[PDB]
Amino acid sequence: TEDATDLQNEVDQELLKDMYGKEHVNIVFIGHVDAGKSTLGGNILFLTGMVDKRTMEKIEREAKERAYFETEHRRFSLLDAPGASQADIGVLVISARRGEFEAGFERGGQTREHAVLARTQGINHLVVVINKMDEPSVQWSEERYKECVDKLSMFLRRVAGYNSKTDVKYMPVSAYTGQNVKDRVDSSVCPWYQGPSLLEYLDSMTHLERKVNAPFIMPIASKYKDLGTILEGKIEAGSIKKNSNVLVMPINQTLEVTAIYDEADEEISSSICGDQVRLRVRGDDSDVQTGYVLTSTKNPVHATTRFIAQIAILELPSILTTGYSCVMHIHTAVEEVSFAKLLHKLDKTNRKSKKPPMFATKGMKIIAELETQTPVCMERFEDYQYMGRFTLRDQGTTVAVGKVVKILD
Ligand SMILES: Nc1nc2c(ncn2[C@@H]2O[C@H](COP(=O)(O)OP(=O)(O)NP(=O)(O)O)[C@@H](O)[C@H]2O)c(=O)[nH]1
Numbered sequence: 001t002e003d004a005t006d007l008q009n010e011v012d013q014e015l016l017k018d019m020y021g022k023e024h025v026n027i028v029f030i031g032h033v034d035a036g037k038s039t040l041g042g043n044i045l046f047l048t049g050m051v052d053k054r055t056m057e058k059i060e061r062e063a064k065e066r067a068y069f070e071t072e073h074r075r076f077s078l079l080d081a082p083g084a085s086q087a088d089i090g091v092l093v094i095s096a097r098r099g100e101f102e103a104g105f106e107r108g109g110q111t112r113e114h115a116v117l118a119r120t121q122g123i124n125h126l127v128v129v130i131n132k133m134d135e136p137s138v139q140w141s142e143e144r145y146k147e148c149v150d151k152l153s154m155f156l157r158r159v160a161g162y163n164s165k166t167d168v169k170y171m172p173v174s175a176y177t178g179q180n181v182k183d184r185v186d187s188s189v190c191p192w193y194q195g196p197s198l199l200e201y202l203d204s205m206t207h208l209e210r211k212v213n214a215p216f217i218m219p220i221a222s223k224y225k226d227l228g229t230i231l232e233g234k235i236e237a238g239s240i241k242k243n244s245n246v247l248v249m250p251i252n253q254t255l256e257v258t259a260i261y262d263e264a265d266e267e268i269s270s271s272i273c274g275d276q277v278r279l280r281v282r283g284d285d286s287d288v289q290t291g292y293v294l295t296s297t298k299n300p301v302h303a304t305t306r307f308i309a310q311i312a313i314l315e316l317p318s319i320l321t322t323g324y325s326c327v328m329h330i331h332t333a334v335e336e337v338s339f340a341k342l343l344h345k346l347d348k349t350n351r352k353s354k355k356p357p358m359f360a361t362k363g364m365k366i367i368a369e370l371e372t373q374t375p376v377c378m379e380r381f382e383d384y385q386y387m388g389r390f391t392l393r394d395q396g397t398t399v400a401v402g403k404v405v406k407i408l409d
Pocket of ligand 1: 031032033034035036037038039040063064131132133134135174175176177
């Protein structure tokens with residue numbers, strides 16, 4: 001009465017990375033006139049293979065009156081301060097050095113202005129980086145750190161509403177020495193800290209504003225019963241609440257939510273994307289099956305039967321073009337998909353081709369138009385990666401993998 005193992009069968013050679021780009025994220029550093037906002041920036045760029053020492057060293061000093069970096073799964077465009085002009089991560093940078101820290105909380109202090117500046121830009125999950133933990137006046141003191149967090153914590157809730165148990169991530173770092181920015185500080189220097197580096201965190205946290213604000217989208221992953229009807233799934237976009245009306249596509253059926261449960265069967269009032277929920281719903285669910293998608297009544301997830309997509313073949317068939325029949329799995333979908341009116345090829349530098357491939361096979365990729373006999377929810381991988389990431393199985397055994405590039409009428 002369920003479904004396991006989605007596109008976790010993407011367990012394939014690591015040329016997944018090629019077609020399947022990294023995730024684009026917009027991050028912005030809000031800081032003081034002395035925070036280390038720039039040195040931290042510059043340090044991340046060098047530390048992350050983006051730029052050399054001499055370049056980094058430039059930026060460090062050109063702080064006197066679009067860049068980006070990478071991480072295993074994300075590319076982080078850097079925005080400024082005073083759609084993809086709206087940030088997904090707001091990192092307030094504070095200095096722990098005695099004097100500077102305390103300074104910003106007083107009168108000339110922009111710390112209150114910055115907190116408000118965050119709220120001004122839709123940061124409802126502020127990452128706070130407490131910089132300068134190497135400083136002689138800091139020495140990585142567990143108390144000086146824990147003194148700053150508290151102070152900031154009380155503060156932020158007051159001046160800008162940030163509740164620090166669920167709206168702000170605190171993390172000690174050293175932009176100058178690079179300690180805790182890429183690799184978690186080694187226990188030698190600081191024994192107490194137990195979390196991840198700054199980039200570790202940034203490379204995996206779910207709360208990305210753009211995504212948290214997008215229309216709700218949770219691919220149904222299980223039909224199993226309980227009090228009544230349940231529906232597990234990793235929310236991929238937006239948020240879901242209590243007593244919230246939700247759509248089921250492609251069956252355009254409205255349906256009200258009644259209770260949310262997490263990975264500890266404990267009733268939570270809400271949940272965002274990235275979470276792995278176990279929603280419980282109420283209504284005519286006489287047509288609700290795994291592979292379908294829960295979504296926003298106003299801006300629902302798309303669902304078509306014709307669409308473009310870049311495919312890449314695997315095993316050893318030789319099968320040709322316009323009429324290949326296999327299994328698609330995009331999210332938790334599982335639907336019939338017939339190769340139709342093809343278009344191009346691909347070669348090394350994600351090229352293309354001028355001649356519509358005769359066929360495809362063992363060692364080849366292509367941007368073909370596929371048709372399904374019945375609608376299936378999907379989005380441009382470019383827009384909602386998961387929701388546009390499929391694989392093709394044939395009579396029991398895997399054969400290809402693709403990302404849907406364009407959705408057709
Ligand atoms: N001890 C120590 N000093 C630091 C550290 N980072 C920066 N500083 C000092 O603080 C000064 C100001 O840093 P800076 O990053 O330029 O501040 P900013 O005003 O936030 N930069 P910008 O305005 O360009 O974003 C630098 O001249 C440097 O000497 C650090 O990690 N440790």
